[PDB]
Structure 1
Amino acid sequence: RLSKGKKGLKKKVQDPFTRKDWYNIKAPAPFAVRDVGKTLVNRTTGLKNANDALKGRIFEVCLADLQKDEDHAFRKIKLRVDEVQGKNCLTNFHGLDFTTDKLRSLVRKWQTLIEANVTVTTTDHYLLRLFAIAFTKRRPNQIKKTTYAQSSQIRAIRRKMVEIIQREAASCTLHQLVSKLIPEVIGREIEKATQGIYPLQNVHIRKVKLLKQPKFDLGALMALH
């Protein structure tokens, strides 16, 4: 009610929403829905055209509203945007992140998690990091409370994990990699092939991070959309 400021500090307020226009967002190819939202960006003119900012921004959106399935209430993906059309905003994959609620919801006591990081490069020369997490399977019809794998057994599990993710992510392009990440084929094959060393309760890939994209090609970027 009473102000607090110093002498001559409140400038005359200008309306900031005259200079703002909306832009619908379309998702790339392998996701089920395409219209995902709307972004309020500044009005374009000379001295910083707004398409530079639209090339700069990224979005973070969950997978439930993309696949229309609430099985994926976790695994928030990130979408860069590099292209613009008329009242449109075409996007591309940038990363895939869990929610910290599920990261707390997976860790139990008296069982081992095994973490593995790889820096793998796809055939389209995108470098990316894959962070996989894998919790140890408590075998039914057992009595002992702690399902501890030995340390050498953990090292063998991590070696097989990095071998699987390298051999099944080095061969495909980025669109096929996202199409394999969506129903979690990688974690299923790690679960299938590590059970001769120590059975694992659940293998997920908890993070995907795209580090460098050396190409801007509208041909493949529009072949997505």
Structure 2
Amino acid sequence: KVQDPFTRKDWYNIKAPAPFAVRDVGKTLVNRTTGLKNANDALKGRIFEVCLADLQKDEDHAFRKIKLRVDEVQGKNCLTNFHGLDFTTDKLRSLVRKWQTLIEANVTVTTTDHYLLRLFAIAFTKRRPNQIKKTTYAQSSQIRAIRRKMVEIIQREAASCTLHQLVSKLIPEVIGREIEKATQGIYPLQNVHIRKVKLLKQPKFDLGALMALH
């Protein structure tokens, strides 16, 4: 068959909110809506992963990709809010240094809007100043103690401050610094990063909270 899709496919718009400092993020060419398979599943159900360096305009943030569930469609418009986040693969390669400890935790959280969000997190042992030893190893009960201080601090500053305040706490890494200065009483633990945040199903479609984000 000669299918050739030039006329039936259109150039939608995908746009950026107020906390994402750029104006536009995408101009996305998918398919024209019409009867016999209307476009709401070929629309909104798509997710949309881009870097944050152009979004908050600081190009030092070339890591930390985000997924974005499409949620608001007008004709020749879209406006996309925060759904997913994952750390960048070669930088989670670039933080693995031999002779100290990598720390993993897979925390399951839900927000008071019953938002099922996991927080996959990885921290790294700091080699102290004035240290001539080639190692900085931990003691595995010290690692366990680190990790219930980890889920202690993420449970202490989780279960509140909903997604405007939550991703407004995620992107300028307040979680990392509160893990750092909270957990350095036991063990120094620099390079605290938040590898993945997992939403699976946003339970609603509703436009009031979406325009409350916009």
TM-score where L is the length of structure 2: 0.96
What is the Cα deviation at residue 15 of structure 1?
Answer: 2.1
What is the Cα deviation at residue 30 of structure 1?
Answer: 2.2
Stretch moving more, 27-36 or 162-171: 27-36
Matched, 1:28 2:10: no
What is the Cα deviation at residue 117 of structure 1?
Answer: 1.2
Secondary structure at the aligned position of 1:51 is classed as coil
Stretch moving more, 24-33 or 35-44: 24-33
Q: C-alpha distance in 2, partners of 1:52/1:184? A: 34
Q: Conserved in 2, the CA contact under 8 Å of 1:133 and 1:203?
A: yes
What is the Cα deviation at residue 51 of structure 1?
Answer: 2.9
Q: C-alpha distance in 2, partners of 1:156/1:52? A: 46
What is the Cα deviation at residue 82 of structure 1?
Answer: 2.0
Of Structure 1 and Structure 2, the greater helix share is in 1
Deviations 1:35-58 (A, max 9, x none): 101111111111111233111211
Of Structure 1 and Structure 2, the greater strand share is in 1
Stretch moving more, 46-55 or 134-143: 46-55
Over the residues paired in the alignment, what is the CA RMSD in angstroms?
Answer: 1.2
Identical columns (%) = 100
Cα distance change on mapping 1:29 and 1:163 into 2, 3 Å: farther
What is the Cα deviation at residue 23 of structure 1?
Answer: 1.1
Q: Conserved in 2, the CA contact under 8 Å of 1:124 and 1:174?
A: no
Stretch moving more, 99-108 or 43-52: 43-52
What is the Cα deviation at residue 34 of structure 1?
Answer: 3.3
Match of 1:56 in 2: 45
Q: C-alpha distance in 2, partners of 1:187/1:138? A: 18
Q: Conserved in 2, the CA contact under 8 Å of 1:119 and 1:128?
A: yes
Q: C-alpha distance in 1, partners of 2:15/2:88? A: 23
Match of 1:178 in 2: 167
Unaligned 5+ residue runs, structure 2? none
Deviations 1:115-157 (A, max 9, x none): 1111101121111100111000100111111100110000010
Match of 1:106 in 2: 95
Q: Conserved in 2, the CA contact under 8 Å of 1:126 and 1:211?
A: no
Q: Conserved in 2, the CA contact under 8 Å of 1:41 and 1:50?
A: no
Runs of 4+ residues over 3 Å off in structure 1: none
TM-score where L is the length of structure 1: 0.91
Matched, 1:216 2:205: yes
Q: C-alpha distance in 2, partners of 1:118/1:99? A: 19
Q: C-alpha distance in 1, partners of 2:9/2:194? A: 38
Q: C-alpha distance in 1, partners of 2:95/2:166? A: 24
Secondary structure at the aligned position of 1:80 is classed as coil
What is the Cα deviation at residue 209 of structure 1?
Answer: 0.8
Secondary structure at the aligned position of 2:81 is classed as strand
Q: C-alpha distance in 2, partners of 1:32/1:123? A: 27
Of 74, 77, 94, 1:85 maps to: 74
Unaligned 5+ residue runs, structure 1? 1-11
Secondary structure at the aligned position of 1:70 is classed as coil
Q: Conserved in 2, the CA contact under 8 Å of 1:128 and 1:212?
A: no
Q: Conserved in 2, the CA contact under 8 Å of 1:20 and 1:41?
A: yes
What is the Cα deviation at residue 215 of structure 1?
Answer: 2.0
Deviations 1:173-196 (A, max 9, x none): 112110000100001000001111
